[PDB]
mmCIF file of C-alpha atoms in Angstrom:
data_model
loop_
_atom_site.group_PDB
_atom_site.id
_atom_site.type_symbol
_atom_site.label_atom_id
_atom_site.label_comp_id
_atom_site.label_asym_id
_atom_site.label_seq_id
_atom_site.Cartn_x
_atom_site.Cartn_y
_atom_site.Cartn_z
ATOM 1 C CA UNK P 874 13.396 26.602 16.523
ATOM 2 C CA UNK P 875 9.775 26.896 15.559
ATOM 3 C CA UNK P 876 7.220 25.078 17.561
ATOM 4 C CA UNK P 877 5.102 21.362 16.761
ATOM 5 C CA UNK P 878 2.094 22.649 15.812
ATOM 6 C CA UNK P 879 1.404 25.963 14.419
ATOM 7 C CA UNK P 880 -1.548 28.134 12.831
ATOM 8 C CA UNK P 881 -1.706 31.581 10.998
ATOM 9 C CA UNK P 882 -4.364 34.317 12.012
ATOM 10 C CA UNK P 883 -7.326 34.689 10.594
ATOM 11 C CA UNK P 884 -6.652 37.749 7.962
ATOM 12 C CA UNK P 885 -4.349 35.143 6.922
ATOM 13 C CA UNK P 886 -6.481 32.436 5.520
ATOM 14 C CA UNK P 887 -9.065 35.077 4.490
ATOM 15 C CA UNK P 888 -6.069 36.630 2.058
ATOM 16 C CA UNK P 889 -5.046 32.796 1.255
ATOM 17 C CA UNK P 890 -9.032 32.618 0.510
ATOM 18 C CA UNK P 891 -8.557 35.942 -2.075
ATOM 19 C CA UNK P 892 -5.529 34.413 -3.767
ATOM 20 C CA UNK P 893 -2.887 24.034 -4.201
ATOM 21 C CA UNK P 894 -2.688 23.110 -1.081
ATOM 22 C CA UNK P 895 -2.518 25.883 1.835
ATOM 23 C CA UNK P 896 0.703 24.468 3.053
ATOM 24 C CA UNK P 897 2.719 24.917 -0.056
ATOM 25 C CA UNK P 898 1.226 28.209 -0.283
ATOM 26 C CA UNK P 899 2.484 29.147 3.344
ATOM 27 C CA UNK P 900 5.902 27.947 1.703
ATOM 28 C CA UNK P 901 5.871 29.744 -1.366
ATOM 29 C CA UNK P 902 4.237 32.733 0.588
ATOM 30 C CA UNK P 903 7.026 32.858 3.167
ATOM 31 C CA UNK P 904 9.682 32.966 0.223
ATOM 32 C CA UNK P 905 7.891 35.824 -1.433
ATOM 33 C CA UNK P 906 8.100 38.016 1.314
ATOM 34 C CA UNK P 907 11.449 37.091 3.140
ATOM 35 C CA UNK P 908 13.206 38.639 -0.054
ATOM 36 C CA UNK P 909 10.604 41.149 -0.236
ATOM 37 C CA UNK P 910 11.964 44.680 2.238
ATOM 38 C CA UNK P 911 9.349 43.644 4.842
ATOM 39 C CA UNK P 912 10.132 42.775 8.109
ATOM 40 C CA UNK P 913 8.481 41.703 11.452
ATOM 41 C CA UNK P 914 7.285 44.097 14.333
ATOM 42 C CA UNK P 915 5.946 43.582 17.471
ATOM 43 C CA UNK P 916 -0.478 38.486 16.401
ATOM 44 C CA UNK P 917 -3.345 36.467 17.862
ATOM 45 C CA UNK P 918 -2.585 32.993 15.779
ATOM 46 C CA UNK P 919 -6.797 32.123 15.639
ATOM 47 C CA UNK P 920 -6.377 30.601 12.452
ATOM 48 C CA UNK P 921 -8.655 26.916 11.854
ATOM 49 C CA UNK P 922 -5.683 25.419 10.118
ATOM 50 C CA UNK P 923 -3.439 23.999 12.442
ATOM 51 C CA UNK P 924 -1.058 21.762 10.950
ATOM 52 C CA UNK P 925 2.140 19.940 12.144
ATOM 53 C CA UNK P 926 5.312 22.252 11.932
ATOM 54 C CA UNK P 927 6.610 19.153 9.280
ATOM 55 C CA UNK P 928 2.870 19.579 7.462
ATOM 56 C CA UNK P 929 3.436 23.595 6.964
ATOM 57 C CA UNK P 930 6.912 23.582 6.035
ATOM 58 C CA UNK P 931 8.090 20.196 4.575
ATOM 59 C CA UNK P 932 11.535 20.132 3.297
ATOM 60 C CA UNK P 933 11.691 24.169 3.077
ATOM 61 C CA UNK P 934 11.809 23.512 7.313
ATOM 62 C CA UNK P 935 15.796 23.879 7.738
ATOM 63 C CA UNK P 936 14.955 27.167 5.488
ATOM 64 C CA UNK P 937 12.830 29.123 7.136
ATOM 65 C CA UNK P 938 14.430 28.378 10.452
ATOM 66 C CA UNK P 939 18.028 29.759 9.179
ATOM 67 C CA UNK P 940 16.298 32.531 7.807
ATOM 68 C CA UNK P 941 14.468 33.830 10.780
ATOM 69 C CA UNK P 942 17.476 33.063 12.540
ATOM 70 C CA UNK P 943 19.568 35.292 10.250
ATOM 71 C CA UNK P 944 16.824 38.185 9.973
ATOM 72 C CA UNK P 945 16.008 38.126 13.385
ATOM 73 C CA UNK P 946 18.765 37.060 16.253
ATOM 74 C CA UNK P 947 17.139 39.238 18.683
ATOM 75 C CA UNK P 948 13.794 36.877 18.754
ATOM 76 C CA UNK P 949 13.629 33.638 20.833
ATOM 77 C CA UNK P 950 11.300 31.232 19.850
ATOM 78 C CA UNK P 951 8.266 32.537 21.590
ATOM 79 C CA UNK P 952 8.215 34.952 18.389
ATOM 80 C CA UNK P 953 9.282 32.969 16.013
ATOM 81 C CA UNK P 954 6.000 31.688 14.904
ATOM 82 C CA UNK P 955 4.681 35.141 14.742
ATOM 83 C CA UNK P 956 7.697 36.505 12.448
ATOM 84 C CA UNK P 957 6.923 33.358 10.277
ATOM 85 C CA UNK P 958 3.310 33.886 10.369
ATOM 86 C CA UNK P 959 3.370 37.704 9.461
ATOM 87 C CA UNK P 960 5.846 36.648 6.749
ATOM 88 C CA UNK P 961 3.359 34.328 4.809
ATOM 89 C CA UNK P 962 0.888 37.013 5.498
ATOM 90 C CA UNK P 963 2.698 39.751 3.429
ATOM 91 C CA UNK P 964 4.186 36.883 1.216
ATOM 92 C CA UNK P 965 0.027 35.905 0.233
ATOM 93 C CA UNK P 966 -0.633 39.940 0.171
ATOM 94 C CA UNK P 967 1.871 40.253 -2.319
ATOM 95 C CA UNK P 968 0.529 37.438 -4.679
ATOM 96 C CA UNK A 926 18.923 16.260 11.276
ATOM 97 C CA UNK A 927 21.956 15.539 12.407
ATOM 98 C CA UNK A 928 22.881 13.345 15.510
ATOM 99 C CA UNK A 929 23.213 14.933 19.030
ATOM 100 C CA UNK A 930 26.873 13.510 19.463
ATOM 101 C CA UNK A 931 29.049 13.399 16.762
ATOM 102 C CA UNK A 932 32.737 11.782 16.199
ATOM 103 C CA UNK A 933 35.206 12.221 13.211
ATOM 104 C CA UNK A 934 37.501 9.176 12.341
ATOM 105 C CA UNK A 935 41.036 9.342 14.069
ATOM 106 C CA UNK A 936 43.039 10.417 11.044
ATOM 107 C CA UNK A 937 40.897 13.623 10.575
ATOM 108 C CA UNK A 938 40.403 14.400 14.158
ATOM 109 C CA UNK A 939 44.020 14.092 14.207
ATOM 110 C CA UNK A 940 44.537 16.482 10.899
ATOM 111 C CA UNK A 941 42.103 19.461 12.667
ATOM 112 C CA UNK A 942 44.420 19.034 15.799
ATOM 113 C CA UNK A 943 47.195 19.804 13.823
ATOM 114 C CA UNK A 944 45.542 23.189 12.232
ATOM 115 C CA UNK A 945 46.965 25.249 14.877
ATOM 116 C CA UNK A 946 47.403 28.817 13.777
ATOM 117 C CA UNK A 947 46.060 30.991 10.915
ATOM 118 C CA UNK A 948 45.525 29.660 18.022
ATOM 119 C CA UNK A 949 42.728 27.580 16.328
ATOM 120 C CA UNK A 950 41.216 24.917 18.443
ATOM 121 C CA UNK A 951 39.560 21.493 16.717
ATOM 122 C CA UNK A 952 35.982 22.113 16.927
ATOM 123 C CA UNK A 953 36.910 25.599 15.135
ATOM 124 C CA UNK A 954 39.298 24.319 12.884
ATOM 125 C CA UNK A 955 36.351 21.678 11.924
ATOM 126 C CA UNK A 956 34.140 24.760 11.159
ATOM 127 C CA UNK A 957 36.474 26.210 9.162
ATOM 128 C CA UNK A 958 37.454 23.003 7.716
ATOM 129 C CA UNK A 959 33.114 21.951 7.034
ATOM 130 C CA UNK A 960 32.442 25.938 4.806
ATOM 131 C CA UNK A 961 36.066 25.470 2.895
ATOM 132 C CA UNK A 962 35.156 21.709 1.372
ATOM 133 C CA UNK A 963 31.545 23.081 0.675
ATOM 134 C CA UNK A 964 32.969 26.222 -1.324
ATOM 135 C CA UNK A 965 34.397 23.838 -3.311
ATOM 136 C CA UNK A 966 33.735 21.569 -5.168
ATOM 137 C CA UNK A 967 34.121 18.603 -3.479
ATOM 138 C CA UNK A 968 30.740 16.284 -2.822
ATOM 139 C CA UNK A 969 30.440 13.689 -0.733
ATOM 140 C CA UNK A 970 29.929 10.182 -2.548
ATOM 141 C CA UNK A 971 28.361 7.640 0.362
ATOM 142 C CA UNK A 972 29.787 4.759 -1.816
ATOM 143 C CA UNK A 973 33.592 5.713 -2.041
ATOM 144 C CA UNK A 974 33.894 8.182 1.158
ATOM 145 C CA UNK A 975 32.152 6.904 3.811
ATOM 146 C CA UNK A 976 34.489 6.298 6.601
ATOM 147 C CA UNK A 977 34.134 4.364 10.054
ATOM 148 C CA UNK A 978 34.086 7.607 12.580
ATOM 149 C CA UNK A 979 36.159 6.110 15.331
ATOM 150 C CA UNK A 980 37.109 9.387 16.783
ATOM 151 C CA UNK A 981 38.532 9.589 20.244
ATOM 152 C CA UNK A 982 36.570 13.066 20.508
ATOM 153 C CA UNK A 983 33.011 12.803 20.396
ATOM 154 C CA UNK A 984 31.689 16.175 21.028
ATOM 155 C CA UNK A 985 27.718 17.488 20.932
ATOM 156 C CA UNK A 986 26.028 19.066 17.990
ATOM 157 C CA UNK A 987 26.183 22.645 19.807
ATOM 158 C CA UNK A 988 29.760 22.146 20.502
ATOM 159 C CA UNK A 989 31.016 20.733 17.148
ATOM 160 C CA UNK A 990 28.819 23.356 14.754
ATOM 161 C CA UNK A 991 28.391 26.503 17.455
ATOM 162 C CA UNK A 992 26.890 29.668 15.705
ATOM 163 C CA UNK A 993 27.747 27.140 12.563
ATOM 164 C CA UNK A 994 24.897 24.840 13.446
ATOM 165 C CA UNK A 995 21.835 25.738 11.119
ATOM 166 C CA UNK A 996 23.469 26.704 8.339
ATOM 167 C CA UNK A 997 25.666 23.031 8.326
ATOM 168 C CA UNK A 998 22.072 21.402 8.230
ATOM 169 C CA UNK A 999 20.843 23.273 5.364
ATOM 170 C CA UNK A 1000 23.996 22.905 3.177
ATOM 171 C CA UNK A 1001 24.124 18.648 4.366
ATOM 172 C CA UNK A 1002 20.424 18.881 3.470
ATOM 173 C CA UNK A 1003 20.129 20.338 0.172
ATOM 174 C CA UNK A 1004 23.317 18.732 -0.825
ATOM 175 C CA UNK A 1005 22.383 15.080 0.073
ATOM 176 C CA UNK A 1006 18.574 15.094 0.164
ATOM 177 C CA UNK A 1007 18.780 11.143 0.406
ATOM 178 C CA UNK A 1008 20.547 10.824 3.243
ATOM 179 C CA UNK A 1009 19.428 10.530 6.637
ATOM 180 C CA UNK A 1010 21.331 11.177 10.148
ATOM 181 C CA UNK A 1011 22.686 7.803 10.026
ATOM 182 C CA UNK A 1012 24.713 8.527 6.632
ATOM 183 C CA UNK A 1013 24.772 12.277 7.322
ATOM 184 C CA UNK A 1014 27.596 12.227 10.036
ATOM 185 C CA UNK A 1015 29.438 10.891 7.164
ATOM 186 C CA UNK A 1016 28.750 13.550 4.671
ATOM 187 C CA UNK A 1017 29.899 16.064 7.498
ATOM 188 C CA UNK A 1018 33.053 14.460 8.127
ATOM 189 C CA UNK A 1019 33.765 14.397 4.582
ATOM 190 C CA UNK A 1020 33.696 17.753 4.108
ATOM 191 C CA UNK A 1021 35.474 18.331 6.920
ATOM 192 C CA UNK A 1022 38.538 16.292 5.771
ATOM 193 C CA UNK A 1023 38.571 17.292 2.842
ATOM 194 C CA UNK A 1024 38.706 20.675 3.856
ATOM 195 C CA UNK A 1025 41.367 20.566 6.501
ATOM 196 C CA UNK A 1026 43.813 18.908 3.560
ATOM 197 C CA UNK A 1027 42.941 21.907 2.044
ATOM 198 C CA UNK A 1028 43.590 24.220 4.623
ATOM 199 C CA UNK A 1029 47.142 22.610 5.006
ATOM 200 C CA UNK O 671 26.685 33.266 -13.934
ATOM 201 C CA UNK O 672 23.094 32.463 -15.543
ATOM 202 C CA UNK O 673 22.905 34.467 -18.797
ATOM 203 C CA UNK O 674 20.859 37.292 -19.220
ATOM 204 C CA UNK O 675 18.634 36.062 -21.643
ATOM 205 C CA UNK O 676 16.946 32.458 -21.214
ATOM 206 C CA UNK O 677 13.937 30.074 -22.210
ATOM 207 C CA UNK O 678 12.152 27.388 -20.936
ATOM 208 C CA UNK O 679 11.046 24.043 -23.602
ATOM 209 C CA UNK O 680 8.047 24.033 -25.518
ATOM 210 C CA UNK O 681 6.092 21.263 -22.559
ATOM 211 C CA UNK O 682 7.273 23.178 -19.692
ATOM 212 C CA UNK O 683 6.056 26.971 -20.691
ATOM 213 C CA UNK O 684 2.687 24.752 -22.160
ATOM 214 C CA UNK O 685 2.524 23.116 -18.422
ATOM 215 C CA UNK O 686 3.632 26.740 -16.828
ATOM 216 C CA UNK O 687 0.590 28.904 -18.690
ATOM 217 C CA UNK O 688 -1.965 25.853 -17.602
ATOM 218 C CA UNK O 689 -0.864 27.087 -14.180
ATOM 219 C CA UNK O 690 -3.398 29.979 -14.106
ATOM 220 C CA UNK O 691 -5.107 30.033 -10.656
ATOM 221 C CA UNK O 692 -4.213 30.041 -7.096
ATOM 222 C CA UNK O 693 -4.089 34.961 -11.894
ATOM 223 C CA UNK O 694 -0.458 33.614 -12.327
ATOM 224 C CA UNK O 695 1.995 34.746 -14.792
ATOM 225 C CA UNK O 696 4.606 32.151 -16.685
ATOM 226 C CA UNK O 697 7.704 33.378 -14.783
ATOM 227 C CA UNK O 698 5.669 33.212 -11.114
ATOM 228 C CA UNK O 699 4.668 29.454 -11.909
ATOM 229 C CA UNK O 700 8.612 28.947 -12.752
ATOM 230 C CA UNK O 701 9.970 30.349 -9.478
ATOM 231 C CA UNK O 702 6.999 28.242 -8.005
ATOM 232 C CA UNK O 703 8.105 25.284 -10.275
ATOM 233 C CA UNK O 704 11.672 26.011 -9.262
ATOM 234 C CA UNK O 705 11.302 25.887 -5.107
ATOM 235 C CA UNK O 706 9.112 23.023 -5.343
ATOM 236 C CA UNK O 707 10.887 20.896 -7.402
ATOM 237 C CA UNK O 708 14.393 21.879 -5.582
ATOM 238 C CA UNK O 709 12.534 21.448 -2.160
ATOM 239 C CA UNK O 710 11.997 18.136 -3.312
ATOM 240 C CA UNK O 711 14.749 15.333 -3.769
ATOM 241 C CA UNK O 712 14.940 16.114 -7.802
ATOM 242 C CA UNK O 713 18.210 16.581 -9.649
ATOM 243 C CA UNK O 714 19.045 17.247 -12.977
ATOM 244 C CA UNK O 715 20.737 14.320 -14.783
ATOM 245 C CA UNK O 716 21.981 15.688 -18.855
ATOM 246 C CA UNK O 717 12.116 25.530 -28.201
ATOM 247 C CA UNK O 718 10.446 27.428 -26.054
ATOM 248 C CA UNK O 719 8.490 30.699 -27.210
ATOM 249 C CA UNK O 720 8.969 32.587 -24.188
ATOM 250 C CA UNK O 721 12.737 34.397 -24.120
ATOM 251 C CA UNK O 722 13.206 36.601 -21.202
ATOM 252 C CA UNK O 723 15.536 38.844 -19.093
ATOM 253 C CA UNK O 724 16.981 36.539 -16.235
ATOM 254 C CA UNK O 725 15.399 39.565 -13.997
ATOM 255 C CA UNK O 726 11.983 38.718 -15.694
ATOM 256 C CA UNK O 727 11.982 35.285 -14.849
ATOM 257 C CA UNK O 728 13.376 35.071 -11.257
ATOM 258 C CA UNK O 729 12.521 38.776 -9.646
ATOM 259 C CA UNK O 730 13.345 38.214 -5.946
ATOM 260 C CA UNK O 731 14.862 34.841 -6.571
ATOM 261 C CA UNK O 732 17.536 35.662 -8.738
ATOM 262 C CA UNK O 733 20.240 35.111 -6.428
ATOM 263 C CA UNK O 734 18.842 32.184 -4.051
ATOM 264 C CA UNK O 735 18.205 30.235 -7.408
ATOM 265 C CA UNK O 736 21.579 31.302 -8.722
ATOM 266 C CA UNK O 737 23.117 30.025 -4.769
ATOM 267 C CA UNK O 738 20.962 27.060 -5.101
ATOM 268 C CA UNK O 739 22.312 25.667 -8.318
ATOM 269 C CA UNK O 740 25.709 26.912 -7.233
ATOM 270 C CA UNK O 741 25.537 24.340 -4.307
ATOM 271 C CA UNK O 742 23.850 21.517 -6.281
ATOM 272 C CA UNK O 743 26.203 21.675 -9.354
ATOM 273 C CA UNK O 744 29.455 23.580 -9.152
ATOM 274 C CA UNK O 745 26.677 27.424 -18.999
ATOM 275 C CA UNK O 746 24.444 23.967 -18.876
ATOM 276 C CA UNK O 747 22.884 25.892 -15.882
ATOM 277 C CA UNK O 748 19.752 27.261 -18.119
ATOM 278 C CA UNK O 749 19.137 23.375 -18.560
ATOM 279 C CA UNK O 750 19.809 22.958 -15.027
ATOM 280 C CA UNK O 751 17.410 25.430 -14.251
ATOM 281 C CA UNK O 752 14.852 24.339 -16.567
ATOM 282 C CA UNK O 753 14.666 21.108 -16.106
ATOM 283 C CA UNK O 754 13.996 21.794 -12.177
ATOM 284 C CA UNK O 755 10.622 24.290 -13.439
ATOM 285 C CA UNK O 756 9.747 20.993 -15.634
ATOM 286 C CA UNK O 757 10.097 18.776 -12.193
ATOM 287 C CA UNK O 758 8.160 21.623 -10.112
ATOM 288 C CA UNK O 759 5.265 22.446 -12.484
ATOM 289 C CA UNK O 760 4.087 18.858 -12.959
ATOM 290 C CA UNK O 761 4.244 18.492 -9.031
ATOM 291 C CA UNK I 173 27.963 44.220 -5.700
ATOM 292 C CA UNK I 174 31.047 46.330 -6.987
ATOM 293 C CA UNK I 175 33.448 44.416 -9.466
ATOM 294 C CA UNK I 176 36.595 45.316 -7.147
ATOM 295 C CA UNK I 177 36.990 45.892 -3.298
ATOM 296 C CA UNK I 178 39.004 46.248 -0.727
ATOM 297 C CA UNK I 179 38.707 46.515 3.287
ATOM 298 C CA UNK I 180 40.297 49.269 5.818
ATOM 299 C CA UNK I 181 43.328 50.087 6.296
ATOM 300 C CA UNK I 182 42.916 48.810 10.192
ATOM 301 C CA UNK I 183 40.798 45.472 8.985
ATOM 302 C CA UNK I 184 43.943 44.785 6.957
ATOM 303 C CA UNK I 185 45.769 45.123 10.112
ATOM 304 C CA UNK I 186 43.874 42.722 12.332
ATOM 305 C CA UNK I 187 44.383 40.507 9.591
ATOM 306 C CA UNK I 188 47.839 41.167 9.904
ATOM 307 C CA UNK I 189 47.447 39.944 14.191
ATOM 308 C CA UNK I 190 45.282 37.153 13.199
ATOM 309 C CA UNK I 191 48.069 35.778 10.872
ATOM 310 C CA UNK I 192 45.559 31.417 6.064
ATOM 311 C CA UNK I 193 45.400 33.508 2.821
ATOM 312 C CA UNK I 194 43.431 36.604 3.123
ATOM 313 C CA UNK I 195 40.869 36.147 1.119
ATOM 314 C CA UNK I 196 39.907 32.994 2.270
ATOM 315 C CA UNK I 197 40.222 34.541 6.077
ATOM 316 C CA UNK I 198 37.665 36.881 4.640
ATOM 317 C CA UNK I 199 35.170 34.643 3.352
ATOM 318 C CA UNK I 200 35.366 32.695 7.097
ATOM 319 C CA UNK I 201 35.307 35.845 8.774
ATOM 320 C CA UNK I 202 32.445 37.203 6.744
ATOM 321 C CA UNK I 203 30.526 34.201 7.402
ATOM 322 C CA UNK I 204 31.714 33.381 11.387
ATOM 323 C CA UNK I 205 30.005 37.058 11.275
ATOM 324 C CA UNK I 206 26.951 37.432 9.858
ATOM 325 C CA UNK I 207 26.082 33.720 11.756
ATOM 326 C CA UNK I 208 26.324 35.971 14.882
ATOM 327 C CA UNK I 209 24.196 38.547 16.069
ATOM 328 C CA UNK I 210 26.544 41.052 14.603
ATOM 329 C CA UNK I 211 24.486 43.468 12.116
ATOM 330 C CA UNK I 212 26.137 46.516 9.904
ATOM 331 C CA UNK I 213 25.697 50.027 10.698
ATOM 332 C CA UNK I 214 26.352 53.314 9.444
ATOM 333 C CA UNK I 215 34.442 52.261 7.719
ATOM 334 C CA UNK I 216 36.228 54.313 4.305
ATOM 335 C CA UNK I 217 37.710 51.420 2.336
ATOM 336 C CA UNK I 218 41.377 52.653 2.277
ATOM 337 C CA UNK I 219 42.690 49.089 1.735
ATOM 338 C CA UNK I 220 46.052 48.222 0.317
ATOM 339 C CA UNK I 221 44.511 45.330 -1.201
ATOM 340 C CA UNK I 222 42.237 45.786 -3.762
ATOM 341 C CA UNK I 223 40.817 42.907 -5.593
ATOM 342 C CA UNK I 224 38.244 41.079 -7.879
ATOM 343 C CA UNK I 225 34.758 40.715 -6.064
ATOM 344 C CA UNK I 226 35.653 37.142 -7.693
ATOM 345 C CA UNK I 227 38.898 36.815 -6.374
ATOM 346 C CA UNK I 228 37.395 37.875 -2.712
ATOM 347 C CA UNK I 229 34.385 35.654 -2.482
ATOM 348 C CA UNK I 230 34.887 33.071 -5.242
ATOM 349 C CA UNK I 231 32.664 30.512 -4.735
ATOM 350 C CA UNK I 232 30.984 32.058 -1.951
ATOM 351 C CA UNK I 233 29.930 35.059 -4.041
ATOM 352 C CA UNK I 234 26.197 34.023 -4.227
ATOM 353 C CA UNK I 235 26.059 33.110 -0.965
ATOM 354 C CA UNK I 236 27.497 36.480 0.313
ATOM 355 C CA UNK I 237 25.600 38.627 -2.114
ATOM 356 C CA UNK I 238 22.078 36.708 -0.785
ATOM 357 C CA UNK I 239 22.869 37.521 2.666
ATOM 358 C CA UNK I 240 23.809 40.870 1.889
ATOM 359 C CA UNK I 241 20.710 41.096 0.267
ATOM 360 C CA UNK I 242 18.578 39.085 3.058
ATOM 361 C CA UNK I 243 20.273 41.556 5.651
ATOM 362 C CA UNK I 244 20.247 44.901 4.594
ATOM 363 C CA UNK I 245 17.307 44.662 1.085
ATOM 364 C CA UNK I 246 17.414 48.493 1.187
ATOM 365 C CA UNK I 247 20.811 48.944 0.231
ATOM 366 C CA UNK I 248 22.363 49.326 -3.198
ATOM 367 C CA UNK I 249 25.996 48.183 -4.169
ATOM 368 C CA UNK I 250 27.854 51.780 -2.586
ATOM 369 C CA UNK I 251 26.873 50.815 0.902
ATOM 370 C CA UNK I 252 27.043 46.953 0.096
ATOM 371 C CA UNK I 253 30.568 47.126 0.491
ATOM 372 C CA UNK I 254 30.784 48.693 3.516
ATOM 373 C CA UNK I 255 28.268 45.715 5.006
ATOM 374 C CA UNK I 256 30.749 43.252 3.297
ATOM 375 C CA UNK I 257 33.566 45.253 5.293
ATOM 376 C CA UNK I 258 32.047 45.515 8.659
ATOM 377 C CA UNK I 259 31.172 41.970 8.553
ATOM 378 C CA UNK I 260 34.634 40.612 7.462
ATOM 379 C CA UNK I 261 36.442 42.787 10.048
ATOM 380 C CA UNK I 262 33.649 42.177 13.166
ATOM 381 C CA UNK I 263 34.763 38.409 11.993
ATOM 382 C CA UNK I 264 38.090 38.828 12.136
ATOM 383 C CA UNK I 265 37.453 40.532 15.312
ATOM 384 C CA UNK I 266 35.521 36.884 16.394
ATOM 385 C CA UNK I 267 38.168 34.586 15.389
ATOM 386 C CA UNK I 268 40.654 36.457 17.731
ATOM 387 C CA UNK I 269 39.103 36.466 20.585
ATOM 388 C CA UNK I 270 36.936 33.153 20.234
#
């Protein structure tokens, strides 16, 4: 599980700024990367967009979940968001 | 998306307690029973296989699905986009007697 | 089980290359056009220029939109397929 | 992604304890599996049983090839099937002991 609310970092929306709606793109982003080779590695989340965990993801929610669950079992949900977020990240990077 | 306690109807409830070796207990045998219906190609049709799920054995989401759980909700998601939880309990136990007739 | 070879209709590639910003290619918009339409609650109910590899078009989503229509309609697949980018790209 | 495969000569065996027809066992196992926290990790494929990748997987064959994929991106199809394998027998290995 992901949390309510959630924002990216900073770099983040400066890359989104770089590359619709910011959402969709944090959808479509996510995607990209996920079946990219990158992965997560252990972050501050100081982003001004913070939007409802429904708002971010939408429909693509059940998704993401399953897939951080599948690419990372070891993480409990404390990371989660920053997997997700560092996902979009390189998913934006890579547009 | 799904509710937090969950019934089948007594026939199928009574069909996964008959699955017994390959033993297998229920809640497994529904597992098993849920990904076999969905790799076919059997879909649910809320019109003409919605059942009553009068179920002795009501059972939580955890305990039902187990590691099972997220990937259930996906495939009852993207399968039946229209439904909610109210109608999705019934798209679950669909699949799941379908696919314990086809197990046996 | 999508052939190697497949194109779009003459509206959706003209829809697809007004998709230009927020720098995009044809076959980007389509995978865009794809997930958004399929993220939404669209299904397909049964001339374009643009003929490419089935690599060309999907990349990295070859085999999640090759699950995806697996699970939503277990050949008429390419009209499947492109009827979901025509949902997606007007979206 | 090879066009035919088989497991171990030992995964065929715990198939053998688990006693319903094997390739279907496989595609549960595979999947009770790689829902766990199980991972692959570098076993020889000396399988009485060799099949079709389509008669193994058959309608799951998208499904197992995207989470093969998802999983383990670096790989190409040699050590695919050795991912397939360690998954179908750590599944096997699941479904016995519950």
């Amino acid at each position: 599980m992901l949390p309510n609310r959630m924002a990216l970092s900073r770099q983040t929306e400066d890359q989104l700024k770089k590359l619709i709606t910011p959402n969709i793109a944090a959808r479509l982003a996510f995607f990209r990367s996920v079946e990219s080779e990158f992965r997560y590695s252990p972050k501050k989340l100081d982003g001004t967009l913070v939007l409802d965990k429904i708002t971010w993801l939408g429909e693509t929610l059940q998704a993401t979940e399953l897939v951080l669950k599948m690419l990372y079992p070891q993480l409990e949900q404390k990371a989660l968001i920053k997997a997700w977020a560092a996902h979009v990240e390189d998913g934006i990077a890579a547009l």
